[PDB]
Amino acid sequence: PTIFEERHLKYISQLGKGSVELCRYDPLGDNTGALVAVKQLQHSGPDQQRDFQREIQILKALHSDFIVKYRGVSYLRLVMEYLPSGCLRDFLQRHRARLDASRLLLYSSQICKGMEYLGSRRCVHRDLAARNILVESEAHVKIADFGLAKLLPLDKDYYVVSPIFWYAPESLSDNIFSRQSDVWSFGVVLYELFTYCDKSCSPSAEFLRMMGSERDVPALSRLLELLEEGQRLPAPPACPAEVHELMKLCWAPSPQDRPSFSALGPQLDML
Ligand SMILES: CN1CCC(NC(=O)c2ccc(Nc3cc(NCc4ccccc4)c(C(N)=O)cn3)cc2)CC1
């Protein structure tokens, strides 16, 4: 087996905390090696470990320009491509003044094409949020963290099994996840994009406000009560009304009434 030999994976810095670190894969020892992102588990708890082998095989199998590339393994460590610009949540709040609604639409369209591919592979990400979207360059974004990703059963369109503010009502109430629960998450991502990930009006900061002053009432209970009423995240300030309408559709109470990614794609592209 031709792997990323541990002795050749030269550590540089941390990308996130298991954990992710930036390494230079230098098999020739002449410091001419390529920079790769390397994922590993730190406090290796037996259940998180089986989840890691599932994750590796999923990413290995996915081939979208909008999903992070799998590179290989080291030994367990998952080797992937390195996207230097970092997290989309950081990128939006740092360069907010230089990014217009047309550029946010380019990101929405790229995440959408990414998620559409995911669906055709009968995979459910489950953690679709701006915190797990990476930046290639100011004109290209890629989806990351397949840590929570689940493959749909060969006979079923749903799957019963923490990020509750991106979770659909069926996810909240009965732990049901499908491509349509990722459409609900996509609607929250559009909110994040169009608020430029402002800490002030984050989906987390906004729902807590809506939940009220009764903290002993379980979040899962208070959030579901709110989403059953029809209460939603507000229209982002200055957000194109055509976009906030697509957000509302992603937020339909029943999963069958939410648009598909295949349907959303042109609607985004044609604005
Ligand atoms: C501790 N402190 C360290 C410094 C800060 N971090 C960064 O400045 C950063 C710089 C480059 C980054 N590029 C990455 C990260 C990756 N996974 C990790 C990741 C996934 C999704 C979102 C964020 C991170 C992958 C991959 N192929 O999956 C590829 N490229 C990611 C962050 C904040 C956290």
Side-chain angles (χ1 to χ4, degrees), residues 1-5 7-9 11-16 18-41 44-46 51-53 55-198 200-208 210-221 223-271:
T2 289
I3 63 150
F4 283 87
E5 285 174 69
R7 70 190 162 101
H8 296 152
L9 280 169
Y11 176 85
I12 297 158
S13 65
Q14 197 130 288
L15 298 184
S19 85
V20 183
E21 47 202 51
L22 167 65
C23 282
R24 181 177 305 286
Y25 176 57
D26 207 37
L28 294 151
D30 66 317
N31 209 38
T32 64
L35 297 178
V36 292
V38 188
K39 187 160 173 184
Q40 62 215 59
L41 298 173
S44 292
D51 269 326
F52 195 56
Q53 272 108 75
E55 180 182 351
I56 298 165
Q57 297 309 128
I58 290 162
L59 194 74
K60 180 169 173 187
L62 298 164
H63 299 97
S64 181
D65 290 337
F66 308 113
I67 286 163
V68 281
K69 286 183 223 299
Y70 163 90
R71 285 296 309 282
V73 288
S74 184
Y75 49 75
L76 191 65
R77 296 169 93 197
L78 154 67
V79 187
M80 301 168 292
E81 74 169 316
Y82 174 65
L83 274 82
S85 303
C87 181
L88 183 67
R89 183 195 53 195
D90 299 13
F91 189 88
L92 290 165
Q93 49 207 13
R94 190 173 35 247
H95 317 105
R96 180 197 199 107
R98 276 300 291 263
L99 304 155
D100 63 340
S102 163
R103 192 45 57 110
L104 302 182
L105 209 268
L106 170 71
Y107 303 149
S108 300
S109 157
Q110 292 178 332
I111 305 139
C112 210
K113 287 161 189 280
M115 288 306 307
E116 200 185 327
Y117 174 73
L118 250 207
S120 78
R121 304 306 319 278
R122 318 191 77 259
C123 178
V124 182
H125 191 278
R126 293 192 41 228
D127 201 0
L128 182 67
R131 63 170 174 275
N132 291 308
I133 313 298
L134 295 160
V135 187
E136 181 54 73
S137 63
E138 46 174 76
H140 189 163
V141 296
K142 295 195 189 195
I143 300 146
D145 180 76
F146 286 81
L148 291 182
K150 302 282 182 178
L151 280 151
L152 288 177
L154 284 86
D155 65 325
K156 298 256 164 189
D157 272 344
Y158 63 92
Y159 191 67
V160 183
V161 60
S162 290
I164 62 157
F165 296 128
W166 283 258
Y167 278 178
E170 69 270 25
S171 296
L172 284 166
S173 61
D174 307 307
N175 287 259
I176 311 162
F177 295 90
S178 62
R179 302 175 187 114
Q180 295 306 300
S181 68
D182 276 336
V183 177
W184 181 288
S185 305
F186 186 74
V188 185
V189 164
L190 294 173
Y191 175 79
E192 288 194 283
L193 277 158
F194 284 91
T195 49
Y196 291 96
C197 284
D198 196 354
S200 163
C201 50
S202 70
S204 192
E206 220 69 20
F207 276 132
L208 292 154
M210 287 183 249
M211 280 193 289
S213 65
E214 260 60 66
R215 285 148 192 94
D216 76 287
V217 181
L220 290 294
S221 304
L223 191 50
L224 196 73
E225 190 187 22
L226 241 47
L227 301 161
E228 279 179 47
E229 275 161 26
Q231 285 186 34
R232 296 293 176 269
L233 280 164
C239 162
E242 329 96 75
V243 170
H244 177 68
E245 277 294 328
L246 292 162
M247 263 157 77
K248 292 192 253 183
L249 283 182
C250 296
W251 296 336
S254 189
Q256 50 164 271
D257 309 317
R258 293 169 194 150
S260 81
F261 287 108
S262 300
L264 280 165
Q267 297 188 99
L268 289 170
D269 296 18
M270 299 186 90
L271 288 170

CSV table of all heavy atoms in Angstrom, one decimal, residues 156-200, unseen atoms left out:
chain,number,residue,atom,x,y,z
A,156,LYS,N,-34.5,3.3,1.5
A,156,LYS,CA,-35.2,4.4,2.2
A,156,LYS,C,-34.6,5.8,1.8
A,156,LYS,O,-33.5,5.9,1.4
A,156,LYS,CB,-35.2,4.2,3.7
A,156,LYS,CG,-36.0,2.9,4.2
A,156,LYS,CD,-37.4,3.3,4.7
A,156,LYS,CE,-38.3,2.1,4.8
A,156,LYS,NZ,-39.7,2.6,5.2
A,157,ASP,N,-35.5,6.8,1.9
A,157,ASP,CA,-35.1,8.2,1.6
A,157,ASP,C,-34.8,9.1,2.8
A,157,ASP,O,-34.5,10.2,2.7
A,157,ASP,CB,-36.2,8.9,0.7
A,157,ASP,CG,-36.0,8.7,-0.8
A,157,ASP,OD1,-34.9,8.3,-1.2
A,157,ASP,OD2,-36.9,8.9,-1.6
A,158,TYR,N,-35.0,8.5,4.0
A,158,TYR,CA,-34.7,9.1,5.3
A,158,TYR,C,-33.8,8.2,6.1
A,158,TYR,O,-33.5,7.1,5.8
A,158,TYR,CB,-36.1,9.4,6.0
A,158,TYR,CG,-36.9,8.2,6.4
A,158,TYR,CD1,-36.7,7.6,7.6
A,158,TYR,CD2,-37.8,7.6,5.5
A,158,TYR,CE1,-37.4,6.4,8.0
A,158,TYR,CE2,-38.5,6.4,5.8
A,158,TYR,CZ,-38.3,5.8,7.0
A,158,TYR,OH,-39.0,4.7,7.4
A,159,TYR,N,-33.3,8.8,7.3
A,159,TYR,CA,-32.5,8.1,8.2
A,159,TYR,C,-32.7,8.6,9.6
A,159,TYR,O,-32.7,9.9,9.8
A,159,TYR,CB,-31.0,8.3,7.8
A,159,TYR,CG,-30.0,7.4,8.5
A,159,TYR,CD1,-30.1,6.0,8.3
A,159,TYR,CD2,-29.2,7.9,9.4
A,159,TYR,CE1,-29.2,5.2,9.0
A,159,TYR,CE2,-28.3,7.1,10.1
A,159,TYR,CZ,-28.3,5.7,10.0
A,159,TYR,OH,-27.4,4.8,10.6
A,160,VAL,N,-33.0,7.7,10.5
A,160,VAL,CA,-33.2,8.0,11.9
A,160,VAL,C,-31.9,7.6,12.7
A,160,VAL,O,-31.4,6.5,12.5
A,160,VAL,CB,-34.5,7.3,12.5
A,160,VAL,CG1,-34.7,7.7,14.0
A,160,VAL,CG2,-35.7,7.6,11.7
A,161,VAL,N,-31.4,8.5,13.5
A,161,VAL,CA,-30.1,8.3,14.3
A,161,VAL,C,-30.3,8.3,15.8
A,161,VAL,O,-30.0,7.4,16.5
A,161,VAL,CB,-29.1,9.3,13.7
A,161,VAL,CG1,-29.5,10.8,13.9
A,161,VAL,CG2,-27.7,9.0,14.3
A,162,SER,N,-27.1,17.8,18.0
A,162,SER,CA,-26.3,18.8,18.6
A,162,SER,C,-26.4,20.2,17.8
A,162,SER,O,-26.9,21.2,18.4
A,162,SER,CB,-24.8,18.4,18.7
A,162,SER,OG,-24.6,17.5,19.7
A,163,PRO,N,-26.1,20.4,16.5
A,163,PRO,CA,-26.4,21.7,15.8
A,163,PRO,C,-27.8,22.0,15.5
A,163,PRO,O,-28.3,22.0,14.4
A,163,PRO,CB,-25.5,21.6,14.5
A,163,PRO,CG,-25.5,20.1,14.2
A,163,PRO,CD,-25.5,19.4,15.5
A,164,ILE,N,-28.6,22.2,16.6
A,164,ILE,CA,-30.1,22.3,16.6
A,164,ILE,C,-30.6,23.6,15.8
A,164,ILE,O,-31.7,23.5,15.3
A,164,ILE,CB,-30.8,22.1,17.9
A,164,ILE,CG1,-30.3,23.2,19.0
A,164,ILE,CG2,-30.5,20.7,18.5
A,164,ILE,CD1,-31.3,23.4,20.1
A,165,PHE,N,-29.8,24.6,15.8
A,165,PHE,CA,-30.2,25.9,15.1
A,165,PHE,C,-30.2,25.8,13.6
A,165,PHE,O,-30.7,26.8,13.0
A,165,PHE,CB,-29.4,27.1,15.7
A,165,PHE,CG,-29.7,27.3,17.1
A,165,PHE,CD1,-28.6,27.4,18.0
A,165,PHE,CD2,-31.0,27.4,17.6
A,165,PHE,CE1,-28.9,27.6,19.4
A,165,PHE,CE2,-31.2,27.6,19.0
A,165,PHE,CZ,-30.2,27.7,19.8
A,166,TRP,N,-29.7,24.7,13.0
A,166,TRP,CA,-29.6,24.4,11.6
A,166,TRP,C,-30.5,23.2,11.3
A,166,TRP,O,-30.7,22.9,10.1
A,166,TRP,CB,-28.2,24.1,11.1
A,166,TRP,CG,-27.3,25.4,11.0
A,166,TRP,CD1,-27.0,26.0,9.9
A,166,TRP,CD2,-26.7,26.1,12.1
A,166,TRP,NE1,-26.2,27.1,10.1
A,166,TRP,CE2,-26.0,27.2,11.5
A,166,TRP,CE3,-26.7,26.0,13.5
A,166,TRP,CZ2,-25.3,28.2,12.2
A,166,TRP,CZ3,-26.0,26.9,14.2
A,166,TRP,CH2,-25.3,28.0,13.6
A,167,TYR,N,-31.1,22.6,12.3
A,167,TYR,CA,-31.9,21.4,12.3
A,167,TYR,C,-33.4,21.7,12.0
A,167,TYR,O,-34.0,22.6,12.6
A,167,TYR,CB,-31.9,20.6,13.6
A,167,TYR,CG,-30.7,19.6,13.7
A,167,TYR,CD1,-30.5,18.8,14.8
A,167,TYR,CD2,-29.7,19.5,12.7
A,167,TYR,CE1,-29.4,18.0,15.0
A,167,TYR,CE2,-28.6,18.6,12.8
A,167,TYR,CZ,-28.5,17.9,14.0
A,167,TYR,OH,-27.4,17.1,14.1
A,168,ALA,N,-33.9,20.9,11.0
A,168,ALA,CA,-35.3,20.9,10.6
A,168,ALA,C,-36.2,20.4,11.7
A,168,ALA,O,-35.8,19.6,12.6
A,168,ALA,CB,-35.5,20.0,9.4
A,169,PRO,N,-37.5,20.8,11.7
A,169,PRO,CA,-38.5,20.2,12.7
A,169,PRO,C,-38.5,18.7,12.9
A,169,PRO,O,-38.6,18.2,14.0
A,169,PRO,CB,-39.8,20.8,12.4
A,169,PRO,CG,-39.4,22.1,11.6
A,169,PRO,CD,-38.3,21.6,10.8
A,170,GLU,N,-38.4,17.9,11.7
A,170,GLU,CA,-38.5,16.5,11.8
A,170,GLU,C,-37.2,16.0,12.5
A,170,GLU,O,-37.2,15.0,13.2
A,170,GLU,CB,-38.7,15.8,10.5
A,170,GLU,CG,-37.6,15.9,9.4
A,170,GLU,CD,-37.7,17.1,8.5
A,170,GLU,OE1,-38.3,18.1,8.9
A,170,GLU,OE2,-37.1,17.0,7.4
A,171,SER,N,-36.1,16.7,12.2
A,171,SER,CA,-34.8,16.3,12.8
A,171,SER,C,-34.8,16.5,14.3
A,171,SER,O,-34.5,15.6,15.1
A,171,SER,CB,-33.7,17.2,12.2
A,171,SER,OG,-33.6,17.0,10.8
A,172,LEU,N,-35.4,17.7,14.7
A,172,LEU,CA,-35.6,18.1,16.1
A,172,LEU,C,-36.5,17.1,16.8
A,172,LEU,O,-36.0,16.6,17.9
A,172,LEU,CB,-36.2,19.5,16.1
A,172,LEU,CG,-35.3,20.6,15.8
A,172,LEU,CD1,-36.1,21.8,15.5
A,172,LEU,CD2,-34.3,20.9,16.9
A,173,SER,N,-37.7,16.8,16.3
A,173,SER,CA,-38.7,16.0,17.0
A,173,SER,C,-38.4,14.5,16.9
A,173,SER,O,-38.6,13.8,17.9
A,173,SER,CB,-40.1,16.3,16.4
A,173,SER,OG,-40.2,16.0,15.0
A,174,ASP,N,-38.0,13.9,15.8
A,174,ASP,CA,-37.9,12.5,15.6
A,174,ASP,C,-36.6,12.0,15.1
A,174,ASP,O,-36.5,10.8,14.9
A,174,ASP,CB,-39.0,12.0,14.7
A,174,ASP,CG,-40.4,12.4,15.1
A,174,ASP,OD1,-40.8,12.2,16.3
A,174,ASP,OD2,-41.2,12.9,14.3
A,175,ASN,N,-35.5,12.9,15.1
A,175,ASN,CA,-34.2,12.5,14.6
A,175,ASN,C,-34.2,12.0,13.2
A,175,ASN,O,-33.4,11.1,12.8
A,175,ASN,CB,-33.5,11.6,15.6
A,175,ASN,CG,-33.0,12.2,16.8
A,175,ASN,OD1,-31.8,12.6,17.0
A,175,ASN,ND2,-34.0,12.3,17.8
A,176,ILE,N,-35.1,12.5,12.3
A,176,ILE,CA,-35.1,12.1,10.9
A,176,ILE,C,-34.3,13.1,10.1
A,176,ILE,O,-34.4,14.3,10.2
A,176,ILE,CB,-36.6,11.9,10.4
A,176,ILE,CG1,-37.5,11.0,11.4
A,176,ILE,CG2,-36.6,11.4,9.0
A,176,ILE,CD1,-39.0,11.1,11.2
A,177,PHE,N,-33.4,12.5,9.3
A,177,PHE,CA,-32.5,13.3,8.4
A,177,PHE,C,-32.6,12.7,7.0
A,177,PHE,O,-32.7,11.5,6.9
A,177,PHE,CB,-31.1,13.1,8.9
A,177,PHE,CG,-30.9,13.8,10.3
A,177,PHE,CD1,-31.0,13.1,11.4
A,177,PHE,CD2,-30.5,15.2,10.3
A,177,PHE,CE1,-30.9,13.7,12.7
A,177,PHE,CE2,-30.4,15.8,11.6
A,177,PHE,CZ,-30.6,15.0,12.7
A,178,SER,N,-32.7,13.6,6.1
A,178,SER,CA,-32.8,13.3,4.7
A,178,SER,C,-32.2,14.4,3.9
A,178,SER,O,-31.7,15.4,4.5
A,178,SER,CB,-34.3,13.2,4.3
A,178,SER,OG,-35.0,14.4,4.5
A,179,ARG,N,-32.3,14.3,2.5
A,179,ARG,CA,-31.8,15.4,1.6
A,179,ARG,C,-32.6,16.7,1.9
A,179,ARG,O,-32.0,17.8,1.8
A,179,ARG,CB,-32.0,15.0,0.2
A,179,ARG,CG,-31.2,13.7,-0.2
A,179,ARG,CD,-31.6,13.3,-1.6
A,179,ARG,NE,-31.1,12.0,-2.1
A,179,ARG,CZ,-31.9,11.0,-2.4
A,179,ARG,NH1,-33.2,11.1,-2.2
A,179,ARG,NH2,-31.3,9.9,-2.9
A,180,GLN,N,-33.9,16.6,2.2
A,180,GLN,CA,-34.8,17.6,2.5
A,180,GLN,C,-34.5,18.3,3.9
A,180,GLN,O,-34.9,19.5,4.0
A,180,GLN,CB,-36.3,17.1,2.4
A,180,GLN,CG,-36.6,16.7,1.0
A,180,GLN,CD,-36.4,17.8,0.0
A,180,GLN,OE1,-36.9,18.9,0.1
A,180,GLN,NE2,-35.4,17.6,-0.9
A,181,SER,N,-33.9,17.6,4.8
A,181,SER,CA,-33.5,18.2,6.1
A,181,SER,C,-32.2,19.1,5.8
A,181,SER,O,-32.0,20.1,6.5
A,181,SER,CB,-33.2,17.2,7.2
A,181,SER,OG,-32.1,16.3,7.0
A,182,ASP,N,-31.4,18.7,4.8
A,182,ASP,CA,-30.2,19.5,4.4
A,182,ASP,C,-30.7,20.7,3.6
A,182,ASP,O,-30.0,21.7,3.4
A,182,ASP,CB,-29.3,18.6,3.5
A,182,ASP,CG,-28.3,17.7,4.3
A,182,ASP,OD1,-27.9,18.1,5.5
A,182,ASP,OD2,-27.7,16.8,3.7
A,183,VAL,N,-31.9,20.6,3.0
A,183,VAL,CA,-32.5,21.8,2.3
A,183,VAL,C,-32.8,22.9,3.3
A,183,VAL,O,-32.5,24.0,3.1
A,183,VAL,CB,-33.7,21.5,1.3
A,183,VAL,CG1,-34.2,22.8,0.7
A,183,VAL,CG2,-33.2,20.5,0.2
A,184,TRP,N,-33.4,22.5,4.5
A,184,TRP,CA,-33.7,23.3,5.6
A,184,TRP,C,-32.4,23.9,6.1
A,184,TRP,O,-32.3,25.2,6.3
A,184,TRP,CB,-34.4,22.5,6.8
A,184,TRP,CG,-34.7,23.4,8.0
A,184,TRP,CD1,-33.9,23.9,8.9
A,184,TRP,CD2,-36.0,23.9,8.4
A,184,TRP,NE1,-34.5,24.7,9.8
A,184,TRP,CE2,-35.9,24.7,9.5
A,184,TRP,CE3,-37.4,23.6,7.9
A,184,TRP,CZ2,-37.0,25.3,10.2
A,184,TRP,CZ3,-38.4,24.3,8.5
A,184,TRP,CH2,-38.2,25.1,9.7
A,185,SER,N,-31.3,23.1,6.3
A,185,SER,CA,-30.0,23.6,6.6
A,185,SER,C,-29.5,24.7,5.6
A,185,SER,O,-28.9,25.7,6.0
A,185,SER,CB,-28.9,22.5,6.8
A,185,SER,OG,-29.4,21.5,7.7
A,186,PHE,N,-29.7,24.4,4.3
A,186,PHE,CA,-29.2,25.3,3.2
A,186,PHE,C,-29.9,26.7,3.3
A,186,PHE,O,-29.2,27.7,3.1
A,186,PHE,CB,-29.5,24.7,1.8
A,186,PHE,CG,-28.9,25.6,0.7
A,186,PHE,CD1,-27.6,25.7,0.5
A,186,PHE,CD2,-29.8,26.3,-0.1
A,186,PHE,CE1,-27.1,26.5,-0.5
A,186,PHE,CE2,-29.3,27.2,-1.1
A,186,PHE,CZ,-27.9,27.2,-1.3
A,187,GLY,N,-31.2,26.7,3.7
A,187,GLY,CA,-31.9,28.0,4.0
A,187,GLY,C,-31.3,28.8,5.2
A,187,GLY,O,-31.3,30.0,5.0
A,188,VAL,N,-30.8,28.1,6.2
A,188,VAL,CA,-30.0,28.8,7.3
A,188,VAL,C,-28.6,29.3,6.8
A,188,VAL,O,-28.2,30.4,7.2
A,188,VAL,CB,-29.9,27.8,8.5
A,188,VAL,CG1,-29.2,28.6,9.7
A,188,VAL,CG2,-31.3,27.3,9.0
A,189,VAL,N,-28.0,28.6,5.9
A,189,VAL,CA,-26.7,28.9,5.3
A,189,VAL,C,-26.9,30.2,4.5
A,189,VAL,O,-26.1,31.2,4.7
A,189,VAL,CB,-26.1,27.8,4.4
A,189,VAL,CG1,-25.0,28.2,3.5
A,189,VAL,CG2,-25.6,26.6,5.3
A,190,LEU,N,-28.0,30.3,3.7
A,190,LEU,CA,-28.3,31.5,2.9
A,190,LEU,C,-28.5,32.7,3.8
A,190,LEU,O,-28.1,33.8,3.5
A,190,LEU,CB,-29.6,31.4,2.1
A,190,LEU,CG,-29.7,30.4,1.0
A,190,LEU,CD1,-31.2,30.3,0.5
A,190,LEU,CD2,-28.8,30.7,-0.1
A,191,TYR,N,-29.1,32.5,5.0
A,191,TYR,CA,-29.2,33.5,6.1
A,191,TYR,C,-27.9,34.0,6.5
A,191,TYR,O,-27.6,35.2,6.5
A,191,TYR,CB,-30.1,33.0,7.2
A,191,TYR,CG,-30.2,33.9,8.4
A,191,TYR,CD1,-31.1,35.0,8.4
A,191,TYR,CD2,-29.4,33.8,9.5
A,191,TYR,CE1,-31.2,35.9,9.4
A,191,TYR,CE2,-29.5,34.7,10.6
A,191,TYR,CZ,-30.4,35.7,10.5
A,191,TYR,OH,-30.5,36.6,11.6
A,192,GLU,N,-27.0,33.0,6.9
A,192,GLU,CA,-25.6,33.3,7.3
A,192,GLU,C,-24.8,34.1,6.2
A,192,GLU,O,-24.1,35.1,6.5
A,192,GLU,CB,-24.8,32.0,7.5
A,192,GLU,CG,-25.3,31.3,8.8
A,192,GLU,CD,-24.3,30.2,9.2
A,192,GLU,OE1,-24.4,29.1,8.6
A,192,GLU,OE2,-23.5,30.4,10.1
A,193,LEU,N,-24.9,33.7,4.9
A,193,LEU,CA,-24.3,34.4,3.8
A,193,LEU,C,-24.7,35.8,3.7
A,193,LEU,O,-23.9,36.8,3.7
A,193,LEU,CB,-24.6,33.7,2.4
A,193,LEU,CG,-23.7,32.5,2.1
A,193,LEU,CD1,-24.4,31.6,1.1
A,193,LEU,CD2,-22.4,32.9,1.5
A,194,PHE,N,-26.1,36.1,3.7
A,194,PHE,CA,-26.7,37.4,3.5
A,194,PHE,C,-26.6,38.3,4.8
A,194,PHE,O,-26.8,39.5,4.6
A,194,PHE,CB,-28.1,37.2,2.9
A,194,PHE,CG,-27.9,36.9,1.5
A,194,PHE,CD1,-27.8,35.6,1.0
A,194,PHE,CD2,-27.8,37.9,0.5
A,194,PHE,CE1,-27.6,35.3,-0.3
A,194,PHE,CE2,-27.5,37.6,-0.8
A,194,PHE,CZ,-27.5,36.3,-1.2
A,195,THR,N,-26.3,37.7,5.9
A,195,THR,CA,-26.0,38.5,7.1
A,195,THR,C,-24.5,38.7,7.3
A,195,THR,O,-24.0,39.3,8.2
A,195,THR,CB,-26.6,37.9,8.4
A,195,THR,OG1,-26.3,36.6,8.6
A,195,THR,CG2,-28.1,38.1,8.5
A,196,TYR,N,-23.7,38.1,6.3
A,196,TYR,CA,-22.2,38.1,6.3
A,196,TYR,C,-21.7,37.5,7.5
A,196,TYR,O,-20.6,38.0,8.0
A,196,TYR,CB,-21.7,39.6,6.0
A,196,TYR,CG,-21.9,40.1,4.6
A,196,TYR,CD1,-23.0,40.9,4.4
A,196,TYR,CD2,-21.1,39.8,3.6
A,196,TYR,CE1,-23.3,41.4,3.1
A,196,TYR,CE2,-21.3,40.3,2.3
A,196,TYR,CZ,-22.4,41.1,2.1
A,196,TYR,OH,-22.7,41.6,0.8
A,197,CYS,N,-22.4,36.6,8.1
A,197,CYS,CA,-22.1,35.8,9.3
A,197,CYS,C,-21.9,36.8,10.5
A,197,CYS,O,-21.2,36.4,11.5
A,197,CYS,CB,-20.9,34.9,9.2
A,197,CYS,SG,-21.3,33.4,8.2
A,198,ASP,N,-22.6,37.9,10.6
A,198,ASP,CA,-22.6,38.9,11.7
A,198,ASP,C,-22.9,38.2,13.0
A,198,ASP,O,-23.9,37.5,13.1
A,198,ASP,CB,-23.7,40.0,11.4
A,198,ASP,CG,-23.6,41.3,12.2
A,198,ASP,OD1,-22.8,41.4,13.1
A,198,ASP,OD2,-24.4,42.2,11.8
A,199,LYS,N,-22.0,38.3,14.0
A,199,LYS,CA,-22.2,37.7,15.3
A,199,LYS,C,-23.5,38.1,16.0
A,199,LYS,O,-24.1,37.3,16.7
A,199,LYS,CB,-21.0,38.0,16.2
A,200,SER,N,-23.8,39.4,15.8
A,200,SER,CA,-25.0,40.1,16.3
A,200,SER,C,-26.3,39.3,15.9
A,200,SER,O,-27.1,39.0,16.8
A,200,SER,CB,-25.0,41.5,15.7
A,200,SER,OG,-26.3,42.1,15.9
